[model samples]
Target: CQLFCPMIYAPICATDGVSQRTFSNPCDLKVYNCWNPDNPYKEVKVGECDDANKPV
Candidate 1:
């Protein structure tokens, strides 16, 4: 048996030149970096950043 829970949509941008995407939360973003620790998504913005600098 499992409990059904909902995650809030949190949109953020990666500072390492990765594409802007949505995460369940800010911590979720760090989970994404676990695979490739070399070029990890360390730095993150509150919202989407188109030019990797210009945040929305």
Candidate 2:
């Protein structure tokens, strides 16, 4: 897996089926998934997980 993301400022939440974790952005998630194919995580939503519960 050859990749390198600039890590743009776009917070994101992801779930690797078993658990949830936050990434800097989608690109980071992709790169991470590449590194951990066994526990690949997908984008759950934009911003942090709490971003949805309380947007204050």
Candidate 3:
């Protein structure tokens, strides 16, 4: 005889864009990189322009 274990629900996998989790935002164009096994989430960086060109 054989036995099988039911799959558990993990919010991370559900929210993962790479995996077919949520129906929203089907096209996951954003690039993602790994930080650490403990923390799979990513942090984004914003670019800023030079303030010298701006008027007072």
The best candidate in terms of lDDT: 2
lDDT for each residue of candidate 1 in 1-56, tens digit (9 for 90 to 100): 12333477766666655565555567667666766578666445667566536532
Q: Write the per-residue lDDT of candidate 2 for residues 2-46, one digit (tens) a residue.
A: 466773698887765554778776777788778776777766678
Worst 10 contiguous positions by lDDT, candidate 2: 47-56
**Candidate 1 lDDT (Cα, 0 to 1):** 0.59
Clashing pairs in 1: none
Deviating ranges (above 4 Å) for candidate 1 = 1-6, 17-24, 52-56
lDDT of 3 by residue, 1-56 (tens): 11233354322212222222221111221222232354232212122223232211
Can you rank all candidates by TM-score, best first?
2, 1, 3
Q: What ranking of all candidate models by lDDT puts the best one first?
A: 2, 1, 3
State each model's CA lDDT, in order.
0.59, 0.67, 0.24
Candidate 1 residue 39 C-alpha distance from true site, Å: 3.8
Model 1 lDDT at residue 49: 61
